[PDB]
């Protein structure tokens, strides 16, 4: 697919169609403030190409939206490079929402989950976020319909322990929570249980192949997951590799080069060399 920058879609639903040719959102995604929408506008709407989000995901006051299983059916990794107040996923006041349905969300690399004041929302206790997040203590899933203990959560699905109950884990009524073998770590596995390549992250189409990863554990280059961007490439947005030509076009209306990375600004103590975009140590204080 294609890689698109951060989005902030609100009010109209026509702005939402900007994700039709998008697989990786290099930034955040905020869908919010849609008061006149109905569930009739979401039954036929789908964005199956979206796979990964670099920053966070925000859903707030999107009326009519009852589930996300049809909106983002292939969302797998939320890297959380930049968080929304230490949250990589915020589901706040999402009325009419019946379930999450992100049956492909396998790993949130950074941040926590905030799901608050979402009425009519069930299928929450049937989610083991510890298999998705490393810091589940910082989660905050309260004030939902699942808090009333009377949700119609019905799931073959794997069963784990959250507090002191052996409950089966499933996203919807027909989608379990995919749990890979312990040996696969976070690399992901196939339906049969074969671990993906050690450079994958979440899921893959063929095991033991870094070119078949759905997402990259470190960096993406030439259609293959790599551990580091080798020379003469540069680490951009801490997820993919780019050449000097790419980092140069972004500067001409203001990114720079530092520590083999294409960053927006030189750090404190370095100034940009106007010739080769390379940050150099300043002479005394820098302006």
């Amino acid at each position: 697919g294609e890689v698109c920058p951060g989005m902030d879609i609100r009010n109209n639903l026509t702005r939402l169609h900007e994700l039709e040719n998008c697989s990786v959102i290099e930034g955040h995604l905020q869908i919010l403030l849609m008061f006149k929408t109905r569930p009739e506008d979401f039954r036929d709407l789908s964005f199956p190409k979206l796979i990964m989000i670099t920053d966070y995901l925000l859903l707030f006051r999107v009326y009519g939206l009852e589930s996300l299983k049809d909106l983002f059916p292939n969302l797998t990794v939320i890297r959380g490079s930049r968080l929304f107040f230490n949250y990589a996923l915020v589901i706040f006041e999402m009325v009419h929402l019946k379930e999450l349905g992100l049956y492909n969300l396998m790993n949130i690399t950074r941040g926590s989950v905030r799901i608050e004041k979402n009425n009519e929302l069930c299928y929450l206790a049937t989610i083991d976020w510890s298999r998705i997040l490393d810091s589940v203590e910082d989660n905050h899933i309260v004030l939902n319909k699942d808090d009333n203990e009377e949700c119609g959560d019905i799931c073959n699905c794997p069963a784990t322990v959250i507090n002191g109950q052996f409950v089966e884990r499933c996203w919807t009524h027909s989608h379990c929570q995919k749990v890979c073998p312990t040996i696969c770590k976070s690399h992901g596995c196939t339906a049969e249980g074969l671990c993906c390549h050690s450079e994958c992250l979440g899921n893959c189409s063929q095991p033991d192949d870094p070119t078949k990863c759905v997402a990259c554990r470190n960096f993406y280059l030439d259609g293959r997951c790599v551990e580091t961007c080798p020379p003469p490439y540069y680490h951009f947005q801490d997820w993919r590799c780019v050449n000097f030509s790419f980092c140069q076009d972004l500067h001409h209306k203001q990114y720079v080069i530092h520590n083999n990375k294409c960053i927006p600004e030189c750090p404190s103590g370095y100034t940009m060399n106007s010739s080769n975009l390379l940050c150099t140590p300043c002479l005394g204080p820098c302006p």
Partner: peptide
């Protein structure tokens, strides 16, 4: 948290 959400959501430029 809810106060922090409104301060960053209702900005004039959305993104």
């Amino acid at each position: 948290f809810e106060d922090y959400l409104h301060n960053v959501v209702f900005v004039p430029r959305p993104s």
